[PDB]
Assembly symmetry: D2
Homo-oligomer: 221 residues x 4
């Protein structure tokens, strides 16, 4: 440090154009202003519940491929925030849109949803803990910069309905999760070759592409 290349910053820069497209996407801008049609948001949070279920499985690969109790613990904690969290952003909107437990059980993921979660899983499974750390990063990191951007429109945070979502993904606690993921990737890659770095960049960019397509399909509901 700090005359040395940081791989997280390198991945960040390569994903900027894509995350900018996510920020100005009609679905996301709809959340910021408060104009997004309420059933389009409903469709999204159902799809996102399904998405989060598969996302948890990638973190579980983290537990298996981590060789360090502390990082196993960190991956295990991330799974709990998805599965055992009645305070989570998702369980808030589930009761606000009065979505039934049977509707959740009966819902099908869209192709765009399946493709994304398959990609993270398959790359996790073909690689090591570096690939799992890189595969899960776009999702949290992009949601953070999206929410920090939306966090000033203004009235975006004060919105009676959509305020909770923007506040949730911009909170100090969610920041700490993204920071953990960033730090983990940086600490795992100190000795990585140029070719390895390019592999991780490719994963990070691909998942960023999937995020854009996820917002798209949520809007095209």
């Amino acid at each position: 440090d700090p005359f040395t290349m940081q791989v997280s910053q390198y991945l960040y820069q390569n994903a900027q154009s894509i995350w900018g497209d996510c920020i100005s996407h009609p679905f996301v801008q709809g959340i910021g202003r408060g104009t997004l049609e309420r059933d389009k948001f409903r469709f999204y949070i159902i799809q996102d519940y399904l998405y989060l279920l598969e996302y948890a499985k990638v973190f579980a690969l983290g537990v298996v491929k981590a060789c360090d109790e502390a990082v196993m613990r960190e991956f295990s904690n991330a799974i709990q925030d998805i599965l055992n969290n009645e305070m989570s952003i998702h369980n808030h909107y589930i009761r606000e849109l009065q979505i039934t437990q049977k509707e959740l059980q009966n819902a099908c993921p869209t192709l765009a949803n399946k493709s994304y979660t398959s990609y993270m899983l398959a790359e996790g499974f073909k690689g090591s803990i570096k690939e799992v750390a890189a595969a899960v990063l776009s999702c949290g990191w992009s949601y953070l910069v999206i929410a920090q951007n939306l966090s000033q429109i203004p009235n975006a945070l004060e919105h009676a309905f959509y305020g909770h979502w923007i506040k949730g993904y911009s909170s100090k606690e969610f920041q700490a999760c993204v920071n953990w993921n960033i730090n983990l990737l940086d600490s795992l890659t100190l000795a990585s070759s140029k070719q390895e770095i390019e592999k991780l960049k490719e994963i990070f960019i691909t998942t960023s592409e999937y995020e854009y397509l996820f917002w798209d399909m949520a809007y095209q509901s």
Copy 2:
């Protein structure tokens, strides 16, 4: 009643119909497809096949029976090693460097990622079901294009049609069909539905692959 292979076939015939009548695919059968689109397809399919071979290696690790281990191992070799793609690598002027530098498209990565992930989350049944659409649909596509006519006699496209409708290719598909049937005779109703879901998801990806290939 009905074999599970036939049950999955029945539920995908509609998608395979759309594949057969796709501009790219009819393009092969009547020689209208532009060489530049087929070139792009061939590079992508090469990349595709490298990831597809991995699903078969997954079959080696999950097979708990020496006979099917061996069958999966031979399928890896067949995929890798007088291949259709080589012919077209030579016929077009695709270099070894061009192949190594090539990037798979989103549609390509999604499809192979999906087969891998389902294979890894499930058992030998799920890997057998995940790889079946690819082979079987090419067989029926090639059998359909075969009777156009002058499809087989075409100086450029003939080889592709001949290859995927051959006796040896049909035997590979038949192995995959019979394996799935023999792995599933004790499967519950819910298991069969899961396998059906995989088989139609992959058929959708096949359609998107041809589509992606046509956009170039």
Copy 3:
């Protein structure tokens, strides 16, 4: 039900002779009476901490291979009981034997330890959720019948040092964990062929053999 074969009972019966050998093993009988040399127990709880770390990874395979939120949640909860449980039986003896965090970090698993955890992992990875459910069952189930047996010597529960261990593995809460694992295996195998059942039996017996060898190596410390 109940004129139908229960696969858990079938596995149980095939493992009885082995679990009986575990019950009357010098190490385990040492716990029951209270005579087990204290540094032999120390060696064991270090090895068992290492063991539990790998055991958690098998439960993580459970999260990835479960296709049902409820069972994912159940596997995730099991991981937490290993990693985020300062009330766990292990963290009790860690402070009682004043075992340092650095000693835990520096400790090597024995072959017998490595072999067992490798076997559960590899079978989990080669199979489906049925194999993971079968691979983790011996450990909890044998510890339960061991503790229920030791639970009457008497004075075994009242022992100032070893009492905590016997009480812990015989508690209503640990019973509920074993019951969950048993129920899960039974519900996953309703349609299993004879050949599949034999595969799961073989896993269950093998892990039972490893348990006996684990106690052995803990005694031969």
Copy 4:
């Protein structure tokens, strides 16, 4: 300094020494080993090789480079397909049924489970390191037994010694050695220590395998 392959070799030479001088192994080299113990070994090693091939399939799935995918795939075929075990299947009277009904011993299952688990938890480096001891130690064992003499000329045991000291077998070991070296030139000190730990763990399992084979 030193190649990592040589570094692992150095740290295991002591265990391989114990393997070379083991009663079972010296038994092969001087024709004293009883046919019944070798028969038992051959059934076990067959079972062993079936699981070992799976670690190589794991190499196919984790190789992110077409050349090494192909090398791993060929290694699966070589393991499966004029094999040493076949010769001894025929020479002794081991039936196809006897092989299918055979159970691997604890020592057998532990060893293969260990290679699988480390391969799956890690990357292509860890699979290359996990499979190396097996091939390399057999090479040095066979090279040692070769000069006894009359070891090679022995009517029963000659073939085994000839096979594991052959040009083609040495080339397989050399591939595995060179692959590990080329996969690790950017590895940190801690990574090298991890790989060393795997390599000596597997060497210990090799010793326990010969031991298990001698107990029958």
